[PDB]
Design a protein around this ligand. Sequence first.
Ligand SMILES: OC[C@H]1O[C@H](O[C@H]2[C@H](O)[C@@H](O)[C@@H](O)O[C@@H]2CO)[C@H](O)[C@@H](O)[C@@H]1O
Ligand SMILES: OC[C@H]1O[C@H](O[C@H]2[C@H](O)[C@@H](O)[C@@H](O)O[C@@H]2CO)[C@H](O)[C@@H](O)[C@@H]1O
Lengths: 437, 436
Amino acid sequence: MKIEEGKLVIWINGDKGYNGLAEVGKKFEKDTGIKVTVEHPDKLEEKFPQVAATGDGPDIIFWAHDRFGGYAQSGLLAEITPAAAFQDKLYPFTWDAVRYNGKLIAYPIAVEALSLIYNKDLLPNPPKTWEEIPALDKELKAKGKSALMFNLQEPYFTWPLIAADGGYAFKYAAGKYDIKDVGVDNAGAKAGLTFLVDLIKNKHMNADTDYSIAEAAFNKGETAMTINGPWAWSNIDTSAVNYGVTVLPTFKGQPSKPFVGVLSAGINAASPNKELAKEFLENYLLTDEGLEAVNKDKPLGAVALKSYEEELAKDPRIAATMENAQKGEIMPNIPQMSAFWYAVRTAVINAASGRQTVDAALAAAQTNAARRKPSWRERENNRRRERRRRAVAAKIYTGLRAQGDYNLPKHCDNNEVLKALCVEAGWVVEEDGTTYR
Amino acid sequence: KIEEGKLVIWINGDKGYNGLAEVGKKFEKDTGIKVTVEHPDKLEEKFPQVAATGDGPDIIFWAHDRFGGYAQSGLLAEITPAAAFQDKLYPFTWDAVRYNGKLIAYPIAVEALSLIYNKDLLPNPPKTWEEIPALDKELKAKGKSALMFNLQEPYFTWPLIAADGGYAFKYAAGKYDIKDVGVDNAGAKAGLTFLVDLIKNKHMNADTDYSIAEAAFNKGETAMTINGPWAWSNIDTSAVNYGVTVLPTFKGQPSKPFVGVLSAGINAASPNKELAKEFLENYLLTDEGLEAVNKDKPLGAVALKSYEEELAKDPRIAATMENAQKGEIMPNIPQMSAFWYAVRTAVINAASGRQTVDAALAAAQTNAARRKPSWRERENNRRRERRRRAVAAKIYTGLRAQGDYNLPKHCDNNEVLKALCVEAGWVVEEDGTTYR
DNA sequence: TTCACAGCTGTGAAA
DNA sequence: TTCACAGCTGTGAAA
Ligand SMILES: OC[C@H]1O[C@H](O[C@H]2[C@H](O)[C@@H](O)[C@@H](O)O[C@@H]2CO)[C@H](O)[C@@H](O)[C@@H]1O
Ligand SMILES: OC[C@H]1O[C@H](O[C@H]2[C@H](O)[C@@H](O)[C@@H](O)O[C@@H]2CO)[C@H](O)[C@@H](O)[C@@H]1O
């Protein structure tokens, strides 16, 4: 797909209220006559950087703020130019989440933080620590239930426990994130991941559990607790589960530290509709009625627009969400964040599966998250150097075959021509390559 | 991984997995086994990869066409149905799920694509593909569109490619001949050229996938879509008054869908083979069980003769079977996977403009039977090149050690090769050109 | 930082 | 069928 003048195409993740956002698009079409299409393709955060480099992709992309720094360093996003008057309608810290190299590269929409979600009837008084979790699962499995199930395939859901005792992604120091100071391999992170693996070894959780499995189970009533964000509440509401949203348990006495995400809307640098996209975002979506319609579909969390957030903050689920947020940290938006997420994802999955030890899986994730990504030019330099090396050899052997008269078979490899060269120069070469004068 | 006394089930995400969950819990009551139903992504791809390591599901629900490559790799337990039991299901279902005189899965439901249309926007559905462009120009003025369907999966486009003569593997002399592929003939070309021309004239979008097609129809923005019985439940919950009818004709010929028999083969590495056959023979393929799955997302024309009597009355099933009769059952042979991939690549590359229709289908025709190199073959290659490097590395190691050439402190083997050339009375130029 | 050999697989040649 | 160089990137050495 390419962005066409006169229409808007939006990409938002499949767990967000895309139907609600589509309704906001219809009003935009009614007031101004521009068609708005909302789509939720899988792996949209990976698809966008691929297509958008060529000028393809949607007009607007929705994702947590951590992915956008990479998008901006690749020149995939337009610079956001809201008047000062409009910026003041959004909390300053949400603008910070979409600031990169001094510039605003997206519109903040809502603040997202994981929370503990528990079945009140199946578990009154939910656990306050992670350590009492195996004990609470013994009693529950008695009733044929499980204690806790959440997504183990995306490190987002495990990071709160890894960060509890001291794990961290990139150390902040002197006003910037140090991309060489990674904390996925320290004692705190090892302790968090070990306690997770010990739950699986001791059968209190299964390592194959993904988002849908963990969802299905809590909404059906087969587990007392789950870990999820505000988007998941709407589906629980329609189930026959009486649930609450509370602080995440402590680990080794310390609070769980979820990585906080700001759902943000970036404008594709190739869109011929930047003014329309800005009009749609500033004066339709980021309004009380715009966010409400999306919010009614799947809760957004703590929205960035002050006016509608003072209404949503009355909700005790949002207060809990922000209680967990306060204990965590805003995600960095630097380009290396995708490299940190890939490394930790591989680590958690390998350790959860027994394919690697915790110490080994995290040591590799530390090296991967810190790994210097070579530039296109460096890649090109390397490619050209090996191209030159082969061609020089090819010419040497091309010439050695033409003028050599080396008593060679009709077809044979360079290794044989080299052998014949060796004997002409006064060497003997065994079959295995051992060579001496 | 599998653990004895439990039952984990894999089935595609567009089927009534929750309905099978309701069936799984009643299997608990009688036999006490806890059953879980998971709907993973690309399960027809993940299964042939994870099965060797013993990782995998007890049961896989999928269309029959891929099981022949599965069974030929040894991933499924051959099925042992009583002669009574074959008689309890239609003989042509067993025929589709049989490779090499052995029964690899249990037939469950017959699936065929049909035209689904919004009566309020289109009381009379078009009988031909050719009138769809004009019909779209009409509905566009009303802010609607004529037709949207999944262009990413060739299953949905194949009916139009087959209409004017396109075929996969010509069945001749009692077997499918992989020497006779018809993805490159004039009928296939005409079928794809028309589909691309719909896109070139902005009557369809090359990027439309299953999700985009379903939303646009269920929301009433498009007047028609092409889909199977599973999609009906979501239209039901929608506010759209829909009909299910015969597919449009192309150049006066019917649309020829590939008919799939949803089958259920058994994990050759499962420790619950007969603990699961209780499910497959005496629980799922029963009138009461198929009802639970059909209640969630409709199965289509089930293979149980008993329940198909009641469901065949449904005018939607009759249309589904009306389209089925005009098409063909899919081959179940191993080359199917390579045929689907080749056709998937042709459709997408022609829809996107990346390739002309001629170039795309010409590439597909050669790929549809391309042989996958065996593991041993790959290992032969790997070992050959390992041998080649070690021989050269030993030569250059000996030259560097005993050669006493006038070489830089650190240099590549090419530099050593040159100093060995000049020693043999050759002159090597800068760029490698070499003579005596 | 640049650099060179390893390494596996791809293209297509020689049967 | 086997075979061989191409081709790009990985690992790790030497500054
Ligand atoms: O798991 C790594 C993943 O974490 C975050 O993604 C979240 C997203 O922020 C939420 O809105 C929700 O959709 O769940 C996602 C995890 O499945 C990061 O934003 C993302 O970049 C990262 O890959
Ligand atoms: O698109 C190629 C694909 O077609 C069929 O897949 C169908 C499947 O049979 C249906 O049950 C449903 O899931 O829709 C699918 C199309 O997306 C073949 O069964 C499959 O082998 C083939 O790859």
